[PDB]
Design an enzyme around this catalytic site. Structure first.
Site: not given
Ligand SMILES: Nc1ncnc2c1ncn2[C@@H]1O[C@H](COP(=O)(O)OP(=O)(O)O)[C@@H](O)[C@H]1O
Ligand SMILES: [Mg+2]
Ligand SMILES: [Mg+2]
Ligand SMILES: [Mg+2]
Length: 1284
Positions: A873, A1249, A317-320, A323, A1251, A1124
């Site tokens: 590929d 969603h 979680a904190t890695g993302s 960043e 939109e 939502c």
């Protein structure tokens, strides 16, 4: 339950049932797996409200009401031994933060802090005293929680500790032994030469170094922060080397500076984008408008490895999260756009699904298993991406754990310490790409949530919404063009403020004087070392001019993004940290002293080259090989890592993992449009091939570059120089032969491959201790990762629409193979070899540089001329897999002959050499071949055969059947992994249903039925008069889908206005001036206290605003849409909306997992005005929600709803029938319900969603004849016409 707590009162409120039926059936079956005879288990949430002032009667009622949420499950009366699980004392769960915001936003200021726990009630009269401690363990994560025996024991969570004082290390009075002692105690990990520096430094100053000063220095000088290995000198095989690793990487920028706007000068790189219409709300008007300006692209990719080994969810979680901060803090403010995720682990060893090659080699107690990482990690990363609001469009997942004969002989190579990778792209304005000058006297500010003690210490804590609010503030700043108050912004990550601040001022050629007690903190007891050096999340440090403060304040408040001025920029380069409580000075240091670098590192290493043994093919047959290969997680379907994360937010996603009518996750690269009004865009691909390193270092690195390129090859980019790379290096520095290999690898790409192709590497990162040592039995064991390079390619897309996928076409075609292996057919370090427990002889490698560039140039030509039908590929799994996945995507058959691919059939089918298979129209075969020859690729091109309608996967050779199977069979096998993953992670019933639906070959895939003309802009006559009705685009803190919601109403002729709840609570706006209001999606308050509930109750409890909503809903001709989160919010506003008496609640999905799907719905008959002329229509739509399952109070409420004719949308399977079967119906709503309207049809709420898909290009799949507008554009145009 009101009990005292010294200064405040600690109220205990009982919550609803915490665990669902299947969850309890899982716990009991898990208890017996340890011989624990438990009669019955019952969990129940319990809320703990530590409040200061008294709570008046009416306020007590409002409080209880805030706390009644979630699914309405079976409620029982407590019975048995009680075990209360709560966060570990001295820690504040994210739930507490968000829930406390809501309390505050509801006028309950008396609430000092709300916290939750889970009260387990276990009946088991047989269990011994010891067997109970064993039970308590299965009910909590030891890393972040603890178990109590009383609801009273919960008081230990709100204790008021006294502010701890700063501690000085007596160097002057004890000599060097003082620094030696502290280094051990405080755990500073300082090398001998660094202790010398510190000794001399403080001796010159003549005073004792404070602990805070030592930790700050220790953190700034670690490997993670200094990157000594990357800047070090080298001696390989007794020979000195001219360039460092970093210098060799910088080389790519020297030879190819094309299109680069920024590199190695920020925590992100920037490249030239496209001049498009940037859409946002004006600061003065509050109206959303298209701003024609260049939208430059920034990129970054990071790793949060070590934390993930200890605690997966928060670690990922904190890695993302960190960043995301790096992207947002680029230059003077930038906006994150799309994400990417990477995972590398040891063998999963799924219970009851053990694979032939999997062997238990043990593991350290201190860390979690490979499986737990893949169970909790992806959810963790996805959690941050979902709650923050950035689609996770591409990634990789590889497993590897084997005792193999490599460079240092027979060893255990793998990922006991995993690779957790997170990166993404974002947009940035031209004038904000460069960091401004820091003026003397500039206020230094900390943007973000209150700090806590973090950094056992590897257990992180994420609060995604907090960051969402901060991002909104940064967004308001760069949208101010020249007036952007942000002078210099930097993210706070490692080393907390102690790193971030000294870096901010230093980067600006200034110094900084600070005030420790101006920093926002959630726990008083912290010491100055802890307040300054803790690594809490969601924080940014920035510089703002003295006179711009009132504006920054105006912005932060409106967004509810907490900030604080904690210092002033000074003339002299000197760091000062004053503490007002003790009236002393924790820090007092000249910058060059704190930043003083120790001697240059120098590594004298030697080359190690693995012998490599031939592949033993005794137990290898092509059939078993195919079955084995499809069962290797690396090859297998990644649905468990894809559907859990949002993929449609921002309305700019063109190409996500899911491909075609059958939504198969085989898209080779990701693609987003540069804006909501353009066909230009960006692209992301990932190149990675670590196993190859166990045989050859440069080769593995080259292949990473190669694959990244081949994975992005089918997108309209143009000049290869447009493709910018990010290089992330995972290694086990010190380990025999890894150092020489890393240098060789970095050189192979930095000095040779990338410059020759014209590819730049503007960003990169390193993680040099990828090893794990422990004792399973009586001896020492070690799990060493192979040198692992992960190349992330990025590029400006010329035309988003011309992007090709692996979805085959049954029309007259030709399947051509571009074999870049040039017949080598290497089998070393491949998936086939791994699947048979081997490493093999020789691996693949970039055989001919010119042909790889030629390959790409040819692909670019064929993509521009529209001569390709499909592309996929060759990577993990070989040509077999490429062909199999294409057939999966096209839901058809394949008839290929491989006689020309060499006599070795196994090799021709399973080699992982670069290249792939292109599908062209039969009539186009010769021309395409001639073109492919123009780039000197003739010898590599081979006609394989063709795609045919059906279920046959046939691979022949000159006249012999080499392999033949049911295409559906291969597909189902290839799915077994994600199936197994979903079975142990989600609701078994759902995972099963989804798996079994793939076995049914008659599935037509998503199809369309239109009751109206998709191209008739019915609002054009109105738009043509210039008269533009305003719509209140309503958002709350946490909403992340507001921009594309406004762009949709914009295209229909409305003048969308940004209405934040704060705007209403502040009287700045009034619904009286509107004839239309739309509640937007997202994660308001992180869905805490029930998704949409805090937002709604925030309105209901403030009588002034409450009446504002009621008045609006009670007017004769007003419209209101709720999508939502908005749908969830408004459903809690039934009392305010007339004709909503029969509306249901929307709760947790049956699967009990976030569902980001491209679901198929049908428009049913209802009074709904927004669905005019759409009734009968059947089209797919974006679905991103975890609490979208409709729930009624009893069958009577459901029959009543049906008879009243209020259902507007229903989920239908691909066969067209209303279905409650997953995932066709992602949440489990009865009768497929996901949209309901009122009696007058002037108000409509729905979970999907519309939109996000009003643009045909924003649809994962759509018929080839659709123009610019999708069917859903009709909802918006219908609102305009209805207004007149
Ligand atoms: N960890 C992950 N998170 C999200 N998507 C992932 C992850 N791993 C793989 N994917 C997606 O799954 C699909 C197939 O993955 P993979 O087989 O690794 O692709 P490739 O064969 O091109 O290297 C891709 O569309 C990819 O982006
Ligand atoms: Mg693959
Ligand atoms: Mg691929
Ligand atoms: Mg890959």
């Amino acid at each position: 339950g009101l009990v005292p707590r010294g200064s405040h009162m600690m109220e205990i409120l009982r919550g609803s049932p915490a665990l669902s039926a299947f969850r309890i059936n899982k716990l009991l079956a898990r208890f017996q797996a340890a011989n624990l005879q438990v009669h019955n288990i019952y969990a129940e949430y319990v809320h703990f409200a530590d409040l200061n002032a008294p709570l008046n009667d009416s306020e007590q009622a409002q409080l209880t009401r805030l706390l009644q949420y979630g699914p309405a499950l079976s409620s029982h009366t407590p019975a048995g031994k009680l075990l209360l699980v709560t966060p570990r004392p001295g820690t504040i769960s994210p739930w507490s933060s968000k829930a406390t915001d809501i309390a505050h936003n509801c006028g309950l200021q008396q609430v000092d802090r709300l916290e939750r726990g889970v009260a387990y009630y276990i009946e088991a009269s047989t269990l011994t005293a010891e067997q109970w401690r064993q039970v308590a363990a299965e009910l909590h994560d030891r890393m972040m929680e603890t178990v109590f025996s009383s609801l009273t024991d919960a008081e230990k969570l709100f204790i008021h500790h006294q502010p701890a004082p700063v501690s000085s290390v007596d160097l002057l009075g004890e000599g060097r032994q003082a620094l030696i002692d502290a280094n051990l105690r405080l755990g500073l990990a300082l090398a001998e030469d660094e202790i010398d520096y510190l000794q001399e430094a403080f001796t010159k100053l003549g005073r004792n170094p404070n602990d805070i000063e030592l930790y700050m220095f220790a953190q700034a000088n670690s490997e993670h922060c200094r990157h000594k290995i990357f800047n070090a000198d080298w001696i390989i095989d007794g020979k000195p080397q001219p360039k460092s690793l970093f210098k060799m990487i910088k080389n790519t920028f020297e030879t190819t500076p094309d299109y680069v706007l920024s590199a190695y000068k920020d925590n992100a790189a920037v490249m030239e984008g496209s001049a498009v219409g940037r859409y946002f709300a004006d600061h003065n008007t509050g109206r959303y408008d298209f701003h024609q300006e260049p939208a430059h692209i920034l990129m970054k990719v990071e790793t949060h490895n070590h934390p993930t080994a200890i605690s997966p969810w928060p670690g990922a979680a904190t890695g993302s999260g960190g960043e995301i901060r790096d992207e947002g803090a680029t230059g003077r403010g930038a906006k994150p756009k799309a994400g990417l995720i990477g995972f590398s682990v040891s063998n999963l060893r799924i219970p009851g699904f053990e694979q032939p090659w999997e062997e238990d080699f043990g593991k350290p107690e201190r860390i979690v298993t490979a499986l737990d990482i893949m169970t909790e990690g992806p959810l963790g990363g996805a959690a941050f991406n979902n709650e923050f609001g950035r689609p996770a469009l591409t990634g990789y997942f590889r497993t590897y754990e084997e005792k193999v004969n490599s460079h240092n002989g027979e060893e255990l190579r793998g990922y006991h310490k995993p690779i957790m990778l997170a990166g993404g792209i974002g947009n940035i304005r031209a004038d904000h790409v460069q960091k401004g000058e820091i003026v003397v006297g500039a206020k230094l500010i900390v943007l973000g949530g209150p700090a806590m003690n973090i950094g056992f210490a590897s257990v992180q804590r994420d609060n995604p919404e907090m960051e969402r609010r901060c991002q909104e503030v940064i967004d308001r700043c760069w949208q101010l063009g020249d007036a952007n108050p942000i002078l210099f912004i930097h993210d706070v990550g490692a080393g907390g403020l102690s790193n971030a601040m000294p870096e901010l001022v230093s980067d600006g050629g200034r110094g900084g004087k600070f005030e420790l007690r101006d920093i926002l903190s959630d726990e008083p007891g912290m010491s100055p070392l802890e307040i300054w050096c803790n690594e809490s999340q969601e924080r940014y440090v920035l510089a703002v001019a003295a006179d711009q403060l009132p504006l920054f304040d105006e912005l932060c408040k409106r967004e509810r993004a907490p900030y604080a001025v904690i210092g002033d920029a000074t003339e002299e380069q000197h760091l000062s940290l004053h503490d007002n409580h003790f009236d002393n000075q924790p820090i007092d240091l000249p910058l060059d002293v704190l930043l003083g670098k120790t001697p240059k590192m120098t590594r004298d290493v030697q080359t190690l080259k693995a012998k490599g043994d031939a592949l033993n093919r005794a137990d290898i047959t092509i059939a078993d090989a195919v079955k084995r290969v499809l069962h290797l997680p690396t090859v297998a379907e990644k649905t468990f890592l894809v559907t859990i994360g949002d993929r449609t937010v921002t309305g700019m996603v063109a190409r996500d993992q899911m491909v075609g009518p059958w939504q198969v996750p085989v898209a080779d690269c990701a693609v987003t449009t540069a804006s909501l009004d353009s066909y230009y865009g960006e692209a992301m691909s990932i190149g990675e091939r670590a196993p190859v390193a166990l045989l050859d270092f440069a080769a593995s690195a080259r292949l990473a570059v190669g694959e990244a390129l081949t994975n992005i090859a089918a997108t309209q980019i143009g000049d290869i120089k447009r493709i910018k790379l990010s290089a992330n290096w995972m290694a086990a520095a010190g380990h025999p032969g890894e150092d020489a290999g890393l240098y060789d690898a970095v050189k192979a790409v930095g000095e040779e491959l990338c410059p020759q192709l014209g590819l730049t590497i503007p960003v990169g990162k390193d993680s040099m201790s990828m090893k794990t040592r422990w004792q399973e039995g009586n001896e020492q064991r070690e799990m060493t990762s192979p040198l692992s390079l992960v190349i992330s390619a990025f590029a400006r897309v010329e035309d988003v629409r011309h992007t090709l996928t692996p979805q085959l076409s049954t029309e007259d075609n030709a399947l051509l193979l571009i074999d870049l292996g040039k017949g080598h057919n290497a089998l070393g370090a491949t998936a086939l070899a791994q699947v048979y427990r081997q490493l093999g002889d020789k691996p693949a490698d970039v055989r001919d540089v010119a042909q790889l560039k030629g390959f790409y140039d040819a692909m670019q030509a064929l993509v521009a001329a529209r001569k390709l039908l499909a592309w996929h590929d060759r990577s993990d799994g070989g040509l077999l897999v490429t062909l199999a996945e294409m057939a999966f995507a096209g839901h058809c058959g394949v008839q290929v002959d491989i006689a020309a691919l060499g006599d070795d059939h196994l090799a021709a089918l399973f080699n992982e050499e670069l290249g792939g298979v292109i599908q062209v129209r039969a009539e186009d075969r010769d021309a395409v071949e001639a073109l492919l020859a123009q780039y000197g690729l003739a010898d590599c091109v081979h006609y394989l055969g063709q795609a045919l309608a059906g279920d046959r996967f046939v691979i022949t050779a000159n006249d012999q059947t080499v392999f033949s199977e049911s295409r559906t069979t291969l597909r189902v096998w290839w799915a077994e992994t994600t199936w197994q993953m979903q079975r142990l992670r989600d609701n078994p019933q759902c995972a099963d249903q989804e798996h079994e639906a793939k076995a049914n070959d008659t599935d037509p895939g998503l199809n369309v039925k239109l009751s109206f003309d998709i191209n008739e802009d019915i609002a054009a006559p109105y738009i043509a008069t210039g008269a533009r009705p305003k719509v209140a685009v309503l958002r709350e803190q946490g909403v992340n889908s507001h921009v594309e919601m406004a762009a949709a109403f914009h295209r229909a002729g409305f003048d969308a206005i940004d209405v934040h709840m704060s705007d209403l609570l502040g009287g700045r706006i009034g619904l009286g001036n509107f004839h239309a209001l739309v509640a937007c999606g997202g994660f308001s308050y992180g869905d805490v206290l029930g998704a949409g509930e805090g937002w709604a109750k925030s309105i209901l409890f403030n009588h002034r605003v409450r009446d504002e909503f009621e008045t609006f809903f009670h007017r004769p001709q007003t419209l209101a849409l709720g999508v939502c989160n908005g749908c969830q919010m408004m459903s809690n506003l039934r009392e305010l909306i007339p004709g909503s008496e029969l509306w249901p609640r929307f709760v947790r999905n049956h699967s009990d997992r976030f569902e980001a799907r491209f679901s198929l719905v049908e428009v049913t008959q209802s009074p709904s005005l927004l669905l005019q002329g759409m009734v009968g229509s059947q089209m797919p739509i974006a679905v991103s929600h975890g609490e979208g399952r409709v729930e009624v109070r009893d069958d009577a409420h459901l029959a009543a709803l049906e008879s009243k004719g209020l259902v507007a949308l229903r989920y239908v399977d691909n066969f067209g029938k209303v279905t409650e079967t997953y995932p066709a119906n992602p949440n489990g709503s009865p009768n497929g319900i996901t949209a309901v309207t009122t009696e007058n049809g002037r108000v409509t709420i729905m979970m999907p969603h519309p939109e996000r898909v009003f643009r045909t290009v924003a649809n994962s799949w759509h018929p080839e004849n659709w123009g610019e507008d999708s069917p859903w554009m009709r909802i918006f145009r219908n609102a305009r016409k209805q207004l007149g």
